[PDB]
């Protein structure tokens, strides 16, 4: 359903140490040694809410990197039978 791209080559080549706030949010290449890393975790990808009183399914939404919010108002209501994510029909993506 999606193809996201890796780009290739953009020096710079900020080694590691030298970076300032001027560099943030802007694309930056970096080099360095991998140290111990955490295991693989799932990430929400398409987020979906079964609600409670207002029945179902309220359908897939896209969130997020990284916010996942706020699911304000929908489906009858929007309250007080408000939203709880479910296991089924929510798709995840690996994260590390």
């Amino acid at each position: 359903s999606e193809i996201h791209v890796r780009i290739s080559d953009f020096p710079t080549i900020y080694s590691l140490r030298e970076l300032r706030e001027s560099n943030l949010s802007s694309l930056v290449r970096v080099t360095g040694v991998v140290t111990r890393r955490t295991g693989v975790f799932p990430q929400l990808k398409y987020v979906k809410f079964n609600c409670l009183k207002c029945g179902s399914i309220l359908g897939p939404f896209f969130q997020d990197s990284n916010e996942e919010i706020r699911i304000s108002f929908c489906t009858n209501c929007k309250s007080k039978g408000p939203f709880r994510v479910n296991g089924e029909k929510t798709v995840y993506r690996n994260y590390q």
Partner: protein, 616 residues
């Protein structure tokens, strides 16, 4: 009025820097000066400045000088706004940072009080535990959804909350938030924790560190394990951790005597701790090149070096060379594919006590920069390695200096290997074998490089020879660390009436204020710039006279094969490998490139006596 008086101080200062800053006439440096500074900063457009204090103190008779020093935190805004004014005037993305230097006075950290609070000041000390650079707001665009964001202002002083007024609208409030990370201005910063200079502390009060925060392009200027000099921007940080201090502690309980009864109490303790801040950071603490040339020209300056090294010490001539040849190291590079050669050098001085083996040490920690001195047995452990420091807080993995590693590409001096037992010696071996220091403790795994030379002083089993015993059996440190130290330069002192008389004479001389006129051919100050010059060479021997070296290696082991009851050793190939770094060392010494077979012979004989002293 206070607005008006403060603003007057503004106009006075602005006039200052616009008025002549320089009295220098004719040849100069003719006027102005600071305009030239604004413009020289306009060259690379990095938007920060450096302006001297002394001038400013002198000009107005100081009424302005004192007006700045005492109330300086009060007078920041007027000053940088004034600079902005002049910039607007004479010059065409606005971030400005103003840092004075060269104060008339230095104050010890222990001499810091609260009467100098909020006021610029000067503090010098030994930097410790620098911390990775993190952004900061001070200008942010944060508002609610209702009705609109993009309001950008405030959060000036450390709070960090919040929008000051004109909420929401139309929900007008009060309320709070929401903060954007897409719109705001950030700067810097890195925190460093500075310690009192080792030499100064009052007995037995023991050192006490204070915390100095680095914002500005002053960032990263600080260095771990170094003396530095700061100028004030002093301020305060609040502290929760002071309770059961004891009191009596002041509080915020608000006065509600206005309004009327028909918020609650709202009480917040205020407990502050002093922590210095820094605008300016220095590492303090053509005509000369002619001298350098004059040094390389002469044919004796080697001998001058050797004789001039350690005035305090009397003779021995061996450990002089032993000490200097550590300062000037080999190529320590290549050969790839592959594993890298060594490179650097090592020495361990051994002898009957009273031989003043320690004077060398103290002289090295005295003379050369980037040198750590420990007396371990009390290392205790790390010590020679990093903690690592956790937590910080806010993510931690900040690394302690410390001991061995904070001296890098340099000479670390340890007394008494024989006292530190097993635990740390192994670590040192890990330093002199793998060349890297691998650190993993209950947290983030790590690898930290230390490339160092290690000068040790190790006392014999009985503090004596034992001439008849093999040195192998005498020094009493484990085999693998033993074989990495090349070579030992053992000294024993024996009674000779000429030499005895010379010692008594020389020592009594030392304890006499006169005559202290005993002097080396080189001064202790120049010998450093000389050495640092001699360090910039990449001595490489392509020369095929290197063939000769082989037979020299070859000449060395044969006669030393039989008997085995000689000083062997082996002689190990690692000694062939040692002759290399020795050669390159002497090349560093004599400025000569591609060296000579002769210098090779010098390193050679050196190793030879180092061997014969092991013979008996």
């Amino acid at each position: 009025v206070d607005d008006v008086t403060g603003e007057k101080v503004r106009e006075a200062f602005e006039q200052f820097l616009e008025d002549f800053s320089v009295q220098s006439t004719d040849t100069g440096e003719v006027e102005k000066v600071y305009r030239a500074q604004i413009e020289f900063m306009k060259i690379y457009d990095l938007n920060t400045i450096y302006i001297d204090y002394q001038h400013l103190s002198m000009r107005e008779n100081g009424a302005l000088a004192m007006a700045i020093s005492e109330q300086y935190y009060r007078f920041l805004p007027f000053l940088q706004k004034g600079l902005r004014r002049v910039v607007r005037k004479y010059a065409p993305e606005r971030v400005f940072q103003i840092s004075f230097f060269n104060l008339p006075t230095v104050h010890r950290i222990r001499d810091i009080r609260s009467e100098k609070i909020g006021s610029l000041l000067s503090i010098s000390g030994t930097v410790t535990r620098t911390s990775e650079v993190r952004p900061e707001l001070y200008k942010a665009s944060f508002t609610c959804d209702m009705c609109r964001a993009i309001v950008d202002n405030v959060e000036q002083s450390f709070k960090y909350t919040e929008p000051t007024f004109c909420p929401n609208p139309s929900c007008e409030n009060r309320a709070f938030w929401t903060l954007n990370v897409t719109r705001s201005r950030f700067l810097d910063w890195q925190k460093v924790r500075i310690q009192e200079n080792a030499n100064e502390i009052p007995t037995g009060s023991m050192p006490r560190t204070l915390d100095v925060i680095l914002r500005g392009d002053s960032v990263e200027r600080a260095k771990p394990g170094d003396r530095c000099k700061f100028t004030g921007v002093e301020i305060v940080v609040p502290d929760v951790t002071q309770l059961g201090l004891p009191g009596v502690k002041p509080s915020s309980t608000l006065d509600t005597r206005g309004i009327s009864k028909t918020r609650s109490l709202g009480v917040r303790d205020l407990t502050y701790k002093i922590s210095f801040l820094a605008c300016h950071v220095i590492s303090i603490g053509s005509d000369e090149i002619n001298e350098l040339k004059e040094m390389v020209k002469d044919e004796h300056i080697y001998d001058k070096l050797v004789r001039s090294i350690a005035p305090a010490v009397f003779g021995h001539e061996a450990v002089k060379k032993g000490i200097l040849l550590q300062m000037l190291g080999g190529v320590h590079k290549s050969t790839v594919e592959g594993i890298k050669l060594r490179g650097d050098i090592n020495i361990c001085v051994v002898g009957d006590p009273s031989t003043s083996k320690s004077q060398f040490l103290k002289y090295v920690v005295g003379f050369a920069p980037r040198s750590v001195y420990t007396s371990g047995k009390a290392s205790s452990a790390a010590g020679l390695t990093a903690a690592v420091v956790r937590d910080e807080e806010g993510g931690d993995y900040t690394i302690e200096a410390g001991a061995l590693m904070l001296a890098d590409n340099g000479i670390c001096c340890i007394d008494e290997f024989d006292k530190m037992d097993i635990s740390d010696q192994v670590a040192i071996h890990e330093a002199m074998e793998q060349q890297t220091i691998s650190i993993a403790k209950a947290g983030i795994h790590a690898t930290l490089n230390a490339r160092t030379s290690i000068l040790a002083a190790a006392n014999p089993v009985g503090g004596r020879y034992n001439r008849k015993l093999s040195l192998r059996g005498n020094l009493n440190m484990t085999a693998p660390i033993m074989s990495r130290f090349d070579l030992f330069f053992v000294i024993l002192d024996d009674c000779n009436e000429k030499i005895d008389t010379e010692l008594a004479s020389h020592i009594v001389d030392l304890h006499m204020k006169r005559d202290e006129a005993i002097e080396p051919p080189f001064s202790a100050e120049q010998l450093r710039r000389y050495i640092k010059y001699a360090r910039t060479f990449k001595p490489i021997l392509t020369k095929e006279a290197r063939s000769y070296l082989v037979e020299k290696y070859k000449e060395l082991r044969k006669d030393d094969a039989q008997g085995f009851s000689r000083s062997s050793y082996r002689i190990t190939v690692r000694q062939l490998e040692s002759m290399i770094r020795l050669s390159e060392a002497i090349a560093r010494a004599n400025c000569v490139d591609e060296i000579t077979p002769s210098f090779i012979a010098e390193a050679y004989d050196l190793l030879r006596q180092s061997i014969i002293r092991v013979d008996v």
